[PDB]
């Protein structure tokens, strides 16, 4: 029994939040929104909702709440730091779950740059891509090395196109050069050379071949 105002009712889920009370947090987030419905304070409530959800091990709730908030509430001011929780929760310590965060944080930065969490997603992005992209580079040396050279030039492309910041970039025109070299394509072998060329111009792989 809680027959209280909105100020108090949500300084109240708000409390049990920090002693992580996340069981009865959210109990008291549900009240809130079904006796004050149309309140801001019931908007902000599906925000912290999904919050306690990911301090806890469900966080497959959490992203039903984010989803469910960000259709319900698409100009809502803290979109923002809706973006970056999802980025959180995909986010953990494989391709699929770092790609998915990436774009999660990728979305965020380019929406709202002013946000107060857009530089912690960039540092976040940098993270992932170097990861992607190491995994990427490590699969190009491999299929190099079995001369599967179309399999491991995808590899390549994959770098150079969507991981263009990367350190790995410089190591993958060289590989593709000598890719396109063995299986024929002289155009794009003197293409991918000028790149390398103009990009880096003191690359040791202007003077070597690529080193297996």
């Not at 590899?155 to 350190?167: D, H």
């Amino acid at each position: 029994t809680q027959d209280w105002s909105v100020e108090k009712l949500y300084a109240e889920a708000q409390d049990e939040l920090n002693s992580s009370n996340y069981t009865r947090a959210v109990k008291l987030y549900e009240i809130l929104e079904s006796r004050f419905p149309t309140s801001r304070h019931a908007r902000q409530s599906q925000l912290d909702t999904a919050y306690a959800y990911y301090k806890d091990d469900e966080k497959d709730k959490a992203l039903a709440a984010i989803e469910r908030f960000r259709r319900l509430h698409p100009q809502h001011p803290n979109m923002d730091y809706a973006l970056y929780l999802r980025g959180l929760v995909l986010f953990n310590e494989d391709p699929k779950a770092n790609r998915e965060a990436y774009q999660a944080f990728a979305e965020l930065v380019q929406r709202f740059p002013n946000s107060k969490y857009a530089a912690d997603a960039t540092a976040r992005m940098v993270k992932l891509v170097d990861a992607l992209g190491g995994n990427e580079m490590s699969v190009a040396r491999y299929y190099m090395k079995r001369g599967a050279y179309i399999a491991a030039a995808n590899r390549a492309k994959k770098i150079i196109g969507s991981y263009q910041n990367t350190r790995y970039v410089e190591e993958s025109l060289a590989i593709l050069e000598l890719a396109y070299k063995k299986l024929d394509k002289p155009q794009l072998a003197a293409d991918t050379r000028r790149v390398l060329e103009t990009n880096f111009p003191k690359s040791p792989f202007l003077t070597h071949a690529w080193q297996p």
